[PDB]
Design an enzyme around this catalytic site. Sequence first.
Site, short mmCIF file in Angstrom:
data_model
loop_
_atom_site.label_atom_id
_atom_site.label_comp_id
_atom_site.label_asym_id
_atom_site.label_seq_id
_atom_site.Cartn_x
_atom_site.Cartn_y
_atom_site.Cartn_z
N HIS A 153 0.86 -1.17 0.00
CA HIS A 153 0.00 0.00 0.00
C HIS A 153 0.90 1.23 0.00
CE1 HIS A 153 -2.41 3.24 1.53
NE2 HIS A 153 -3.46 2.56 1.12
N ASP A 163 0.95 4.32 1.16
CA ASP A 163 1.22 4.97 2.43
C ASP A 163 2.13 4.09 3.28
OD1 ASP A 163 -0.36 7.34 2.03
OD2 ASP A 163 -2.16 6.33 2.83
N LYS A 164 1.82 2.78 3.31
CA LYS A 164 2.64 1.87 4.08
C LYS A 164 4.05 1.71 3.52
CE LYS A 164 0.97 0.86 8.01
NZ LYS A 164 2.21 1.47 8.56
N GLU A 212 10.34 11.90 6.61
CA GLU A 212 9.11 11.70 5.88
C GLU A 212 9.43 11.14 4.50
OE1 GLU A 212 6.96 12.12 7.93
OE2 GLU A 212 7.07 14.01 9.02
N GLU A 230 14.38 15.92 8.54
CA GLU A 230 15.48 16.42 9.33
C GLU A 230 16.18 15.27 10.03
OE1 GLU A 230 12.11 17.46 10.28
OE2 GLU A 230 12.18 18.76 8.52
N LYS A 281 -5.70 -3.85 0.59
CA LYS A 281 -6.45 -3.32 1.71
C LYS A 281 -7.48 -4.37 2.12
CE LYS A 281 -7.36 1.11 1.89
NZ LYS A 281 -7.91 2.44 1.57
N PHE A 332 -8.27 -3.82 -10.44
CA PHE A 332 -7.23 -3.22 -9.63
C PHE A 332 -5.89 -3.69 -10.20
CE2 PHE A 332 -6.12 -2.79 -4.74
CZ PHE A 332 -5.11 -1.90 -4.99
N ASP A 374 -2.03 5.71 -6.51
CA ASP A 374 -2.40 6.56 -5.39
C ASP A 374 -1.14 7.02 -4.68
OD1 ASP A 374 -3.90 7.70 -3.22
OD2 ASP A 374 -3.81 5.81 -2.12
N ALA A 375 -0.93 8.33 -4.58
CA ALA A 375 0.23 8.84 -3.87
C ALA A 375 0.19 8.38 -2.42
CB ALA A 375 0.28 10.34 -3.94
N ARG A 420 0.12 8.33 7.27
CA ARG A 420 -1.25 8.42 6.77
C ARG A 420 -2.04 7.14 7.05
NH1 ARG A 420 -2.51 12.69 3.03
NH2 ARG A 420 -4.19 11.24 2.51
N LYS A 421 -1.48 6.26 7.88
CA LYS A 421 -2.16 5.04 8.30
C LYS A 421 -2.09 4.88 9.82
CE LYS A 421 -4.02 3.63 4.59
NZ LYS A 421 -4.23 5.08 4.40
N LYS A 474 10.80 8.35 13.04
CA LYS A 474 11.08 9.17 14.21
C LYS A 474 11.88 8.39 15.25
CE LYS A 474 6.69 11.73 13.69
NZ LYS A 474 5.45 12.10 14.38
N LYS A 483 11.04 11.74 19.88
CA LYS A 483 9.73 12.13 19.39
C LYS A 483 8.69 11.30 20.14
CE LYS A 483 12.45 13.78 15.97
NZ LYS A 483 13.91 13.96 16.17
N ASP A 497 5.58 11.30 20.04
CA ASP A 497 4.52 10.72 19.23
C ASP A 497 4.67 9.21 19.14
OD1 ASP A 497 3.01 12.98 18.47
OD2 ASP A 497 4.12 13.24 16.58
C1 LIG Z 1 8.99 20.04 17.10
S1 LIG Z 1 8.74 19.90 15.33
C2 LIG Z 1 8.81 18.07 15.13
C3 LIG Z 1 10.20 17.47 15.32
C4 LIG Z 1 11.18 17.86 14.20
N1 LIG Z 1 10.76 17.23 12.92
C5 LIG Z 1 12.63 17.47 14.54
O1 LIG Z 1 13.43 17.43 13.58
O2 LIG Z 1 12.93 17.27 15.74
C6 LIG Z 1 6.95 19.91 15.19
C7 LIG Z 1 6.34 21.29 15.17
O3 LIG Z 1 6.76 22.00 16.35
C8 LIG Z 1 6.94 23.37 16.04
N2 LIG Z 1 8.33 23.76 16.25
C9 LIG Z 1 9.35 23.87 15.33
N3 LIG Z 1 10.45 24.34 15.85
C10 LIG Z 1 10.14 24.58 17.18
C11 LIG Z 1 10.89 25.12 18.24
N4 LIG Z 1 12.14 25.54 18.11
N5 LIG Z 1 10.26 25.27 19.43
C12 LIG Z 1 8.99 24.85 19.53
N6 LIG Z 1 8.19 24.33 18.61
C13 LIG Z 1 8.83 24.23 17.43
C14 LIG Z 1 6.44 23.56 14.61
O4 LIG Z 1 5.06 23.84 14.65
C15 LIG Z 1 6.73 22.19 14.01
O5 LIG Z 1 5.94 21.94 12.86
C1 LIG Z 2 -8.84 4.13 -3.71
S1 LIG Z 2 -7.20 4.86 -3.57
C2 LIG Z 2 -7.64 6.53 -2.95
C3 LIG Z 2 -8.32 7.43 -3.98
C4 LIG Z 2 -7.39 7.85 -5.11
N1 LIG Z 2 -6.32 8.76 -4.60
C5 LIG Z 2 -8.15 8.54 -6.26
O1 LIG Z 2 -7.46 9.21 -7.06
O2 LIG Z 2 -9.38 8.34 -6.36
C6 LIG Z 2 -6.68 4.31 -1.95
C7 LIG Z 2 -6.07 2.93 -1.93
O3 LIG Z 2 -7.01 1.99 -2.49
C8 LIG Z 2 -6.32 1.00 -3.21
N2 LIG Z 2 -6.68 1.04 -4.62
C9 LIG Z 2 -6.04 1.64 -5.67
N3 LIG Z 2 -6.61 1.40 -6.83
C10 LIG Z 2 -7.67 0.57 -6.52
C11 LIG Z 2 -8.64 -0.06 -7.33
N4 LIG Z 2 -8.66 0.04 -8.66
N5 LIG Z 2 -9.53 -0.86 -6.71
C12 LIG Z 2 -9.49 -0.95 -5.37
N6 LIG Z 2 -8.63 -0.41 -4.52
C13 LIG Z 2 -7.73 0.34 -5.17
C14 LIG Z 2 -4.83 1.23 -2.95
O4 LIG Z 2 -4.46 0.52 -1.79
C15 LIG Z 2 -4.79 2.74 -2.73
O5 LIG Z 2 -3.65 3.14 -2.00
CL LIG Z 3 9.27 14.65 13.61
CL LIG Z 4 -7.47 10.22 -2.17
CL LIG Z 5 -5.75 4.71 1.45
NA NA Z 6 5.74 15.95 13.82
NA NA Z 7 -6.46 7.86 0.58
#
Ligand SMILES: C[S@@+](CC[C@H](N)C(=O)[O-])C[C@H]1O[C@@H](n2cnc3c(N)ncnc32)[C@H](O)[C@@H]1O
Ligand SMILES: C[S@@+](CC[C@H](N)C(=O)[O-])C[C@H]1O[C@@H](n2cnc3c(N)ncnc32)[C@H](O)[C@@H]1O
Ligand SMILES: [Cl-]
Ligand SMILES: [Cl-]
Ligand SMILES: [Cl-]
Ligand code: NA
Ligand code: NA
Lengths: 380, 380
Positions: free
Chosen positions: A14, A16-17, A42, A55, A166, A235, A243-244, A249-250, A270, A274, A276
């Site tokens: 998938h 996203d995965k 990311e 980062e 899926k 499919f 699909d990007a 996103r999961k 992460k 972090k 999270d």
């Molecule tokens: C803390 S950053 C996530 C971790 C980061 N990706 C890293 O490299 O550690 C998440 C969000 O916190 C906020 N943030 C960024 N720099 C920060 C800082 N110096 N102090 C506090 N919050 C900050 C921003 O809103 C950012 O999108």
């Molecule tokens: C349906 S797509 C999301 C919508 C899509 N971004 C669009 O442009 O409509 C989400 C996920 O469904 C699955 N998918 C992609 N094509 C499909 C298809 N033809 N039939 C069923 N599932 C599909 C894949 O796992 C994909 O990542």
């Molecule tokens: Cl992060």
């Molecule tokens: Cl979508």
């Molecule tokens: Cl999806």
């Molecule tokens: Na974050």
């Molecule tokens: Na989606």
Amino acid sequence: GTFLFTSESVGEGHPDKICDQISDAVLDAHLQQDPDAKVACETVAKTGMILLAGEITSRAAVDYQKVVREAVKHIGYDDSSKGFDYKTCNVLVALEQQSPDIAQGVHLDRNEEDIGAGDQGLMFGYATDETEECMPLTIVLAHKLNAKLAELRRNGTLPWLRPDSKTQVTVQYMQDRGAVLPIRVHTIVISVQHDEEVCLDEMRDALKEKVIKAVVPAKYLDEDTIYHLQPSGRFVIGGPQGDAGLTGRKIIVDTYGGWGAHGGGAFSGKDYTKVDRSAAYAARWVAKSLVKGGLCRRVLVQVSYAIGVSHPLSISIFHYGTSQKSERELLEIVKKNFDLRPGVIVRDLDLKKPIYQRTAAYGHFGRDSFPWEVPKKLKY
Amino acid sequence: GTFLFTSESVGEGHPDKICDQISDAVLDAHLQQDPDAKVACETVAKTGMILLAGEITSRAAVDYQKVVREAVKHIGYDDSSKGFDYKTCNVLVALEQQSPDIAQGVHLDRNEEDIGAGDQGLMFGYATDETEECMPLTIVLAHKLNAKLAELRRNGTLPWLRPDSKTQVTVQYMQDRGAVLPIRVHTIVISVQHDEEVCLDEMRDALKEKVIKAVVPAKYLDEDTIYHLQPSGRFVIGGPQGDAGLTGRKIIVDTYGGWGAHGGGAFSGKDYTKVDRSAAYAARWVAKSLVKGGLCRRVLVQVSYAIGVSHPLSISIFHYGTSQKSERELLEIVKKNFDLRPGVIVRDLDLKKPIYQRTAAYGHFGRDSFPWEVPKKLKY
Ligand SMILES: C[S@@+](CC[C@H](N)C(=O)[O-])C[C@H]1O[C@@H](n2cnc3c(N)ncnc32)[C@H](O)[C@@H]1O
Ligand SMILES: C[S@@+](CC[C@H](N)C(=O)[O-])C[C@H]1O[C@@H](n2cnc3c(N)ncnc32)[C@H](O)[C@@H]1O
Ligand SMILES: [Cl-]
Ligand SMILES: [Cl-]
Ligand SMILES: [Cl-]
Ligand code: NA
Ligand code: NA
Ligand SMILES: Cn1cc2c(n1)c(=O)n(-c1cccnc1C1CC1)c1cc(Cl)c(F)cc21
Ligand SMILES: Cn1cc2c(n1)c(=O)n(-c1cccnc1C1CC1)c1cc(Cl)c(F)cc21
Ligand SMILES: [Cl-]
Ligand SMILES: [Cl-]
Ligand SMILES: [Cl-]
Ligand SMILES: [Cl-]
Ligand SMILES: [Cl-]
Ligand SMILES: [Cl-]
Ligand SMILES: [Cl-]
């Protein structure tokens, strides 16, 4: 007293995965050389492209081309006929150092145990005694259906399968004093990418006989169970081409399949600073410890943090009526038994170890006896 | 009987939220010319870069450079001194048509009312009578703190402010037969990007006096309230330069701040055929209708779908003990009063109208009397 509940899961291919797995392959590659790497990686995937953005501050020397392509290879995208090929895709890198402002506020010149949370945020842990692994049956079955697809793809049993899939499982439950008891499977959805040649009847037959029946106990399936197998009808186009995908996103697939609660943070890509990730793992560990310790049948734990502050800002317990102890008493037990500073969680759960890619498909919880799945014996 | 609960929000210039707003600016631009545009637009942001990735099939002629840069301008990133500038950033586009395989399975040659769900998935709606807008107080206050920051930035009152911000509010609640009653604010976090010159004391004083006191009623603040204001100590680097952003990474901020439940789907960048958005909006509408109709004080609604199938696969109601009707009776009322096919939701909630960019900061629910916020009068 009965109700329905639905959870979904997705396969390793998938899009996203894919991104989650690549993000965690990058994290693991860093941690293998530098246990203290600061990683916020990311991944974005679309036709022909893996982009890394984020980062990283690390002493490691990491070959991103190799790490990315090996992860894609493992997933199974190895030919243009499948829509994506690790050998020939574009890998683009937009990685910088961690913000110095974050670094100074979180970890610079701080004792490890007293490192600040790497961000603010809220996180939840959940556990339920309805399965031995203390997870919702809906999400367990959904994951296992995707794992079965990958197994039958890899062993050549169903060679028309491709990596993108899926699944979705609806269970009918009853309630017993706040605990939940599965009765039957109401509906199953499976969608999986496939080759041009195989027909819809062959696929639907195989999905029922070789996938569903190999995963879901017959006692849960009956004449009324509804099956939506390849419901789109076609499919062939799949993976990032269909699909990007993006990292994080999961997050509900990664956790409890809609049960419990979620604070919004993604796990993959992460390091332990972090919260999270680390505090969500710790909250799972707390929840599972309360259930396996016989204090609760089901429990939800919230924690929260501020960037730069080590101790959580809040801790909350909800036991769904499944304990003879009050929620206040359970909170006191948690506070006496756990230290939820990130710089202590890292020690308890061994979070500098490069095992993260394994977490990035089929859920982070309920499998493989990861440290957060091994209960703490509680004193009270 | 008391407990704590924490929710967070982020500002318009938070890098994830930038992405949501750009994704929805792109959606709106398409819908302004082609009400039936099929849009799945992901945005990624890092230093100097907005990348659009995803799938759009539309009769519109959209100038992506203009749409993106105008959205960034609106947010306030207009100079390299702030870390990001709409005039001079890179805008990269990796957009393709919607997969033909999806199109044929979802909407090709189908009557609009009988269009299939654009994907499988699960979605929840929630409402709580603790505020007049039927939202959790934690999340309402967190949003309003970010809105206040943007107001004082834009009016020149606090000219050291920059667009990237985060807030977090912990409320102490009591319970009353399943309803929740806010007592006091336990903890507030505010982190906001700032200019090089302003000192930490000036900022902390302003954040308390001009932000918190202008938003949070004094009755909720007391000598014990904990304030974490600029807790990192320095936040000059911010926006995408500080932290990569992606569309759909603030899904809990977008919804209920951890209350209720979430099925995992992101909203921004998606047209109505993507049930992740339309069915979540409809589920909010159902929940709010049940509370404002006097049937419940608090309620959670789950729905789920299969790709290509119009009717939901499951519907579930949980009322937290706040109705004299059973959950089964409420479900029957919902089924009699609502049609949750996407091709009917689009009519009821007017989801071809280009209002989506407005939804993409400060939460999708509880404000502006959007169609999903106007209760349906229920017959039973
Ligand atoms: C803390 S950053 C996530 C971790 C980061 N990706 C890293 O490299 O550690 C998440 C969000 O916190 C906020 N943030 C960024 N720099 C920060 C800082 N110096 N102090 C506090 N919050 C900050 C921003 O809103 C950012 O999108
Ligand atoms: C349906 S797509 C999301 C919508 C899509 N971004 C669009 O442009 O409509 C989400 C996920 O469904 C699955 N998918 C992609 N094509 C499909 C298809 N033809 N039939 C069923 N599932 C599909 C894949 O796992 C994909 O990542
Ligand atoms: Cl992060
Ligand atoms: Cl979508
Ligand atoms: Cl999806
Ligand atoms: Na974050
Ligand atoms: Na989606
Ligand atoms: C009267 N009361 C106390 C709580 C509560 N209502 C509530 O709705 N949640 C909550 C939030 C999100 C998802 N699920 C739940 C709970 C299953 C209801 C709580 C969560 C926590 Cl972690 C806690 F400690 C208390 C409540
Ligand atoms: C015995 N029982 C029935 C349900 C339930 N336990 C439960 O945990 N959830 C649930 C899931 C996620 C977050 N919050 C909740 C509910 C506040 C508990 C349900 C959700 C729904 Cl939509 C429903 F219809 C039933 C239950
Ligand atoms: Cl290092
Ligand atoms: Cl079991
Ligand atoms: Cl066992
Ligand atoms: Cl964030
Ligand atoms: Cl069109
Ligand atoms: Cl109010
Ligand atoms: Cl009013």
